[PDB]
UniProtKB/Swiss-Prot annotation, chain A:
This is Small ribosomal subunit protein bS18. The lineage of its organism: Bacteria, Pseudomonadati, Pseudomonadota, Gammaproteobacteria, Enterobacterales. It holds the Pfam family Ribosomal_S18. Binds as a heterodimer with protein bS6 to the central domain of the 16S rRNA, where it helps stabilize the platform of the 30S subunit. GO terms for molecular function: mRNA 5'-UTR binding; small ribosomal subunit rRNA binding; structural constituent of ribosome. The gene is rpsR. Keywords: Acetylation, Ribonucleoprotein, Ribosomal protein, RNA-binding, rRNA-binding. GO terms for cellular component: cytoplasm; cytosol; cytosolic small ribosomal subunit. InterPro entries: Ribosomal_bS18, Ribosomal_bS18_CS, Ribosomal_bS18_sf. It comes from Escherichia coli (strain K12).
Curated annotation (Swiss-Prot), chain B:
Residues 57-65 have a biased composition (Basic and acidic residues). Gene3D superfamilies: Ribosomal protein S8. The gene is rpsU. GO terms for molecular function: rRNA binding; structural constituent of ribosome. It comes from Escherichia coli (strain K12). Keywords: Ribonucleoprotein, Ribosomal protein, RNA-binding, rRNA-binding. This is Small ribosomal subunit protein bS21. InterPro entries: Ribosomal_bS21, Ribosomal_bS21_CS, Ribosomal_bS21_sf. It comes from the Bacteria. It holds the Pfam family Ribosomal_S21.
UniProtKB/Swiss-Prot annotation, chain C:
InterPro entries: Ribosomal_uS11, Ribosomal_uS11_bac-type, Ribosomal_uS11_CS, Ribosomal_uS11_sf. One of its GO terms (biological process) is translation. It comes from Escherichia coli (strain K12). Keywords: Methylation, Ribonucleoprotein, Ribosomal protein, RNA-binding, rRNA-binding. SUPFAM superfamilies: Translational machinery components. Located on the platform of the 30S subunit, it bridges several disparate RNA helices of the 16S rRNA. Forms part of the Shine-Dalgarno cleft in the 70S ribosome. PANTHER family: 40S RIBOSOMAL PROTEIN S14/30S RIBOSOMAL PROTEIN S11 (PTHR11759). HAMAP family: Ribosomal_uS11. This is Small ribosomal subunit protein uS11. Pfam families: Ribosomal_S11. Part of the 30S ribosomal subunit. Interacts with proteins uS7 and bS18. Cross-links to IF-3. In stalled ribosomes contacts ribosome rescue factor SmrB. The keyword DNA repair does not apply.
Curated annotation (Swiss-Prot), chain F:
It comes from Escherichia coli (strain K12). One of the primary rRNA binding proteins. Located near the base of the L1 stalk, it is probably also mobile. Required for association of the 30S and 50S subunits to form the 70S ribosome, for tRNA binding and peptide bond formation. It has been suggested to have peptidyltransferase activity; this is highly controversial. InterPro entries: NA-bd_OB-fold, Rib_uL2_dom2, Ribosomal_uL2, Ribosomal_uL2_bac/org-type, Ribosomal_uL2_C, Ribosomal_uL2_CS, Ribosomal_uL2_dom3, Ribosomal_uL2_RNA-bd_dom. PROSITE patterns: RIBOSOMAL_L2. This is Large ribosomal subunit protein uL2. This protein can be partially replaced in vivo by its H.marismortui (HmaL2) or human (L8, from the 60S cytoplasmic ribosome) homolog. Keywords: Acetylation, Ribonucleoprotein, Ribosomal protein, RNA-binding, rRNA-binding. The keyword Ribosomal protein applies. The modification N6-acetyllysine is found at residue 241.
Length: 65, 65, 116, 88, 100, 271
RNA sequence: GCUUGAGUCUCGUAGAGGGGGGUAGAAUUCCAGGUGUAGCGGUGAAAUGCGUAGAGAUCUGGAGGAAUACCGGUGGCGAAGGCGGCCCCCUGGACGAAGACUGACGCUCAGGUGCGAAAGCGUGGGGAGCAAACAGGAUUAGAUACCCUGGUAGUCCACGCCGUAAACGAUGUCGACUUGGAGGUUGUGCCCUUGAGGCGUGGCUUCCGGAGCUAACGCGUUAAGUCGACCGCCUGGGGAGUA
């Protein structure tokens, strides 16, 4: 409930998978904003950062890989 | 989805199935494209959720109990 | 017969039937049993007790392989999937890990329209 | 598109200076320069109907400004349509 | 001159030619008046999913500024090269600051 | 482009022209021409061996270089021309050393554009280069069967062959009919589709438009006597027979593929 | 002439706005091979269907097409229809801040012109899944239906035509005015970033309700209140959106 990208400052980078793996669940799905608490601007950046890191094989699409 | 439950466990308790995929997003895809009711029943899901939100806080009456 | 040591228990639970197939580490099968192949034809096939006897009747015909610990891969919805894995404990196996290999698409081809 | 480099080149060519940016003859040339730019965009693609509507918003706005200009001062009008090349 | 980022992965047994390849493309852009800014070479690391299976590819980040005709002649080079596996190109906005 | 004629007379009512304005409108390049004499369907023995051909307009053979044996020389496409022997158009191609040759004109090729052949050549549409250097998946045309043979496959108008797979020293080609077929990996191919893809839309309007293409009338089997065709005869349009050729072999279904010498190179038959 | 309407410029801000190309992954289907064996599939119950010529299950590899799970939200964009993977290219609009400029250039619009879901048509492709029609099996008094097993057009793409929908907030477009509350979303200024705050200010949006209106239901500052400007339309039910 204490949104992390609105707290300091951010544009959600796709390369730093350290913070980016905090916002995926165990099966590779993106966690909704009602759970984490991110602002909706930082949620649209996040999904575009998950999917672009899922492209470059940094994060997985699913756990069936 | 996937659970390992390191060698002394004695019981499965796969609780991430009710949290990820098991029958929620699978009974939804077993039939019925609809193309139309994900506009209609998504509306009625949240039309009743806001009457679960507003009418629950203002339910404070005497009611003899 | 080769005396395989650890195997994989693919459990394909459907609404109509539960098929339980025991493979090996490579993934080629060593014996299977269904809810329909154990009697239980028709309405009793779609029951959790029928997957239980499909689990015990898959525990033999791999008695000639000597499988000790097995990794579970349940797949699909239905009345099995949860009472068959309690019957693989009761058959005398070790459960290494359980997964869920339900083939969920990412909004792929159109499903059918039925049940009206 | 009408970049900042291209916008300032037409304001000084048709107005007092770069400060006089909203004059009547300036706006006609700015709408003309973008319509003549978008002839290349709609030479291909041929079905961009949502951007065609923006093109017709600025054809018709240029038609109303030139018709304001012809009523307001005819002398400044006949300068412009020969200088900018749009009359039969 | 729009800015770019170019993350291309490399087929891993041909990773010796990568400083040959980083030189190969930064000659095409600086040679055609385009500034390179962050050659953050990530090295070899592990993949999340198999990619023709081929585990553990080799990552190169560029972050170039370049005219658009050059960055398209660059991107048709990544197709025909058999060493580049899954490149991508991105938005301008800026240059970056090594962003590990 | 695709011009529909106005019905000013019968016959002109159903004409569709395929009008290319980029074609050359002069007498063609005279050193690369030699004569083409009509056969009529007749051989050594003089007897008609292919029916329904004969007549037509006189047409001179354009020596078209399918083989593309000019490795690593720049070549500027001079002008697109009409070849009556083909369905496709041909491009007059000037090399840098001063030699002109005809090639088939691909889809995007215009006058002034540059092609070249050889293994060094780029993957620009129009270049000829061997298939062990062509990328997998890309679309080629003017495909060779044997190395140095010249080019056999995908050389009609609009036709192309997509390259499917490369398993060792063979290239798996999906032919235009839908047939998967292996060739030698050292055979050449020209990239891109063949131009004049609106050739399929010409519908010729009238009966005389096929007579000046050499195609003579086809007489049906049922209109003949029983001595002439294995159909034929009968009082008033009797057929009652399984359909056959004029020499008795079953048509409409009967497969005539029996070679056994080239069945190694075929992966899938035509479906 | 003037500037409070409208407009132009300079910096930014969000967006499934639009067209063009490319690519990614999961799944379905089919083919090819390995293992393996008598069932699978389906239903309220069955049967047709499939399968010892070895299916189903399972593994690997291949070929194709179409759609984008999670994000995802009475959330966002667009004039409406509508638009969801990520990427690049070419573009439209809206909004905000500070100014500077034009000087009423405006609003509505019969006829006209453009756009316009889906189904349909035309020509050329593509065809995985789904699926009218059609065949078979069931259910039934009947069942040319729901249910089951199959399956053609079609959905797909390029280019034309059609011009219709419960094309619906059943609510024309534009402007001004008249108590509030809780939210969302996108800017922006002040103040302590002083610790995930405190205060103004704009645009869009959802819900509840005050006067007022309404036949009532209800709308209720994105009015169905108080007014103005133009336009479209209505005149008992059928017959008839028919000849």
């Amino acid at each position: 409930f204490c949104r992390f990208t609105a707290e300091g400052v951010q544009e959600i980078d796709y390369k730093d998978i350290a913070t980016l793996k905090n916002y995926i669940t165990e099966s590779g799905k993106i966690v909704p904003s009602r759970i984490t608490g991110t602002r909706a601007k930082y949620q649209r950046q996040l999904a575009r950062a998950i999917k672009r890191a899922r492209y470059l094989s940094l994060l997985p699409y699913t756990d069936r890989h | 989805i996937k659970v390992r439950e390191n060698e002394p466990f004695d019981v499965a308790l796969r609780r991430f199935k009710r949290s990820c995929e098991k029958a929620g997003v699978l009974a939804e895809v077993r039939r019925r494209e609809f193309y139309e009711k994900p506009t209609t029943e998504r509306k009625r899901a949240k039309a009743s959720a806001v009457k679960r939100h507003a009418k629950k806080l203002a339910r404070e009456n005497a009611r003899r109990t | 017969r080769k005396q395989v040591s650890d195997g994989v228990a693919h459990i394909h639970a459907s609404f109509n039937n539960t098929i339980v197939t025991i493979t090996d580490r490579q993934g080629n099968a060593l014996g299977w049993a269904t809810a329909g192949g154990s009697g239980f034809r028709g309405s009793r096939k779609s029951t959790p007790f029928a997957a239980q006897v499909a689990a015990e009747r898959c525990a033999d015909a791999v008695k000639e392989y000597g499988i000790k610990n097995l990794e579970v891969m349940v797949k699909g919805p239905g009345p099995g999937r949860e009472s068959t894995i309690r019957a693989l404990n009761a058959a005398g196996f070790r459960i290494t890990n359980i997964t869920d290999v339900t083939p969920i698409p990412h909004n792929g081809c159109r499903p059918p329209k039925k049940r009206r | 598109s009408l970049s900042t480099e291209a916008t300032a080149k037409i304001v000084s060519e048709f107005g007092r200076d770069a400060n006089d940016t909203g004059s009547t003859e300036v706006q006609v040339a700015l709408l003309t320069a973008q319509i003549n730019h978008l002839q290349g965009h709609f030479a291909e693609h041929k079905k961009d109907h949502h951007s065609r509507r923006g093109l017709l918003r600025m054809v018709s706005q240029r038609r109303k400004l030139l018709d304001y200009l012809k009523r307001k001062d005819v002398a400044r009008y006949t300068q412009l349509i020969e200088r900018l090349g749009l009359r039969r | 001159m729009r800015h770019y980022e170019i993350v291309f992965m490399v087929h891993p047994d041909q990773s010796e030619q990568v400083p040959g390849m980083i030189e190969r493309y930064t000659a095409a852009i600086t040679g055609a008046e385009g500034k390179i800014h962050r050659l953050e070479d990530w090295g070899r690391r592990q993949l999340a999913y198999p990619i023709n299976k081929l585990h553990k590819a080799h990552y190169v980040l560029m972050n170039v500024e370049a005219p658009q005709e050059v960055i398209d002649e660059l991107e048709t080079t990544f197709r025909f090269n058999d060493a580049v596996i899954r490149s991508m190109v991105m938005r301008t906005k800026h240059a970056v600051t090594e962003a590990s | 482009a695709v011009v529909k004629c106005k019905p000013t007379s019968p016959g002109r009512r159903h004409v569709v022209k395929v009008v290319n304005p980029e074609l050359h409108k002069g007498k063609p390049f005279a050193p690369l021409l030699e004569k083409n004499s009509k056969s009529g369907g007749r051989n050594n023995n003089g007897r008609i061996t292919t029916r329904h051909i004969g007549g037509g307009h006189k047409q001179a053979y354009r020596i078209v270089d399918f083989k593309r044996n000019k490795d690593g020389i720049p070549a500027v496409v001079e002008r697109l021309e009409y070849d009556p022997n083909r369905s496709a158009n041909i491009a007059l191609v000037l090399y840098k050393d001063g030699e002109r040759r005809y090639i088939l004109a691909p889809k995007g090729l215009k006058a002034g554009d540059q092609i070249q052949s050889g293994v060094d050549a780029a993957i620009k549409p129009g270049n000829t280069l061997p298939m062990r250097n062509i990328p997998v998946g890309s679309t080629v045309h003017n495909v060779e069967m044997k190395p140095g043979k010249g080019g056999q496959l995908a050389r009609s108008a609009g036709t192309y062959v997509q390259i499917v797979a490369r398993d060792g020293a063979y290239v798996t080609l999906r032919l235009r009919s839908g047939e998967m077929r292996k060739v030698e990996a050292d055979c050449r191919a020209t990239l891109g589709e063949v131009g004049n893809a609106e050739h399929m839309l010409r519908v010729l309007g009238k009966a005389g438009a096929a007579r000046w293409r050499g195609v003579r009338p086809t007489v049906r089997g049922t209109a003949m006597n029983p001595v002439d065709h294995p159909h034929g005869g009968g009082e008033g349009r009797n057929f009652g027979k399984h359909p056959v050729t004029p020499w008795g072999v079953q048509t409409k279904g009967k497969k005539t593929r029996s070679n056994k010498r080239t069945d190694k190179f075929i992966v899938r038959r035509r479906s």
